[PDB]
Amino acid sequence: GPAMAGNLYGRDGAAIGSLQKLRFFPLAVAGGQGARLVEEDGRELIDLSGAWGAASLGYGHPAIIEAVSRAAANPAGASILSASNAPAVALAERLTASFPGRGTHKVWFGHSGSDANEAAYRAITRATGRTGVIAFIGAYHGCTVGSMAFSGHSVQADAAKADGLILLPYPDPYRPYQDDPTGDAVLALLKERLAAVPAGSIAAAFIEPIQSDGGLIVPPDGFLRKFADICRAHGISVVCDEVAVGLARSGRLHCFEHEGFVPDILVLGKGLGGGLPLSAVIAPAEILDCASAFAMQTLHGNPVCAAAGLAVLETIEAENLTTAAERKGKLLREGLARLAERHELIGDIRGRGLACGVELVRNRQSREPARAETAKLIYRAYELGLVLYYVGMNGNVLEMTPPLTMTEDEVRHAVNLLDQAFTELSTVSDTLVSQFAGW
């Protein structure tokens, strides 16, 4: 009753509406250091989710502290709309320099992935005068009217969709569409769907190079390249959404580096900001210059957020985090393989760098999803002092996206906590887990 209602979690219930909440257990945070969160009572936890990938440098990283304090004390105004400002320009410069399109592309800045996907779509349709768009079932591209319009994930399933939207199955090696582990069946479908619409009616294609919230799915080898070829054959812009899986997390700087294509447009978000809201679209000049005063919010490109972004990119260099994500990802995936030797629930282990997914199944032959078991597992992890969540259209993929700065010892220890969670998930009752709405 009153003590529980009076604590930070119970206060959260009383003050903050459930509209934006995605809660699985009563995590109630008052501080953070490194890869640790600190609850109101002082209890420490290891954040395997790394705030869903946003805490790219963990919590209280010196580079973020310095850049944000400096920017606070001497800000170049508060916006990029009606002034140029030094940090946003230098950020935009560094991002386009990182991209193979350095010679032909510019940047738009936003507050979130949703903002950024929304802008890219609006810009392509504006530039092009066409409405049609290809995206994937399971694809999470935002939670705003404009971004949910071409999303395919459960969260957006009730949302109004874009005129000319074609949603395709994302090819899952673990559950392959039409039993084809190559994904060519999806490409054949695409072509067939394209033959049924007017020539040149599709302007855009959205893809995640790993589908994150749809269930950490690394698509079959060659699939994305061949997908991009088709798009290019029809003059369709390829937009790569690397809001979850970009900027060093995959063990390459840009996830598309694993996949033998370069996108026309690259979308970035979450960890770009290091804990502050920051997003960007890197796209051909003629796309982002087709209009002005068109996709704008007052605080877009504010210097504190832009300084945080520069800090993240600078730290990716200084601490060699692209290599560190590769190295620690391998370690993490190896620890998980050892868990699979002990716990039959583990049906699959997948991912690249520190974007890792573990799929849980009731039987390894049937692959029946283990939804109830997954929900309790993460609850028991939280009790044990490990934060991670589940994703996927079946509620049954554990997601791991820790800060790129997480140490090797922390990885080892997260795997051991995970091991104990597997051993103990049914100590969590149905009634307890039922209290949290989840997805």
Ligand X SMILES: Cc1ncc(COP(=O)(O)O)c(/C=N\[C@@H]2CCCCNC2=O)c1O
The residues annotated as belonging to the active site are 140
Give the x/- contact pattern for a second copy in 361-400, rule: CB under 8 A.
--------------------------x-x-----------
Burial class (CB in 10 A: 0-12, 13-18, 19+), 295: buried
How many residues form the binding site for a second copy (CB under 8 A)? 111
Q: Which of residues 116-155 bind ligand X (CB under 6 A)?
A: 117, 140-142
Minimum CB separation from a second copy for residue 366, in Å?
29
Helix (H, G, I), strand (E, B) or coil at 61: coil
Question: Which of residues 26, 50, 113, 183 is near ligand X by CB under 6 A?
Answer: 113
CB atoms within 10 A of CB 6: 11
Measured in residues, the chain has a length of 439
Position 14 contacts a second copy (CB under 8 A): yes
Question: Which of residues 295, 313, 381, 404 is near a second copy by CB under 8 A?
Answer: 295
Q: Which does 241 bind (CB under 5 to 8 A by kind): a second copy, ligand X, none?
A: ligand X
**Longest CA pairwise span in the chain (Å):** 64
Contact 267, 113 (CB under 8 A): yes
Q: Which of residues 56-85 bind a second copy (CB under 8 A)?
A: 59-60, 64-65, 68-69, 72-85
Cβ nearer to a second copy, comparing 64 with 346: 64
Q: Is 103 annotated to bind ligand?
A: no
Q: Which two tokens stand for residue 232?
A: 């290019």
Amino acid identity of 255? Answer: C
What is the edge-to-edge ordering of all strands in the sheet holding 389-391?
Answer: 346-352, 355-360, 397-400, 389-391
DSSP 430: H
Q: Which of residues 271-330 bind ligand X (CB under 6 A)?
A: 296-299
Question: Which of residues 6, 188, 233, 289 is near a second copy by CB under 8 A?
Answer: 289
Cβ nearer to a second copy, comparing 47 with 242: 47
- The DSSP H or E segment spanning 412 is helix 408-424
- The DSSP H or E segment spanning 222 is none
- The DSSP H or E segment spanning 434 is helix 430-434
Binding region: 113-114, 298
Can you give the binding site for ligand X, defined by CB under 6 A? Answer: 22, 52, 81, 112-114, 117, 140-142, 208, 212-213, 241, 243-244, 269-270, 296-299
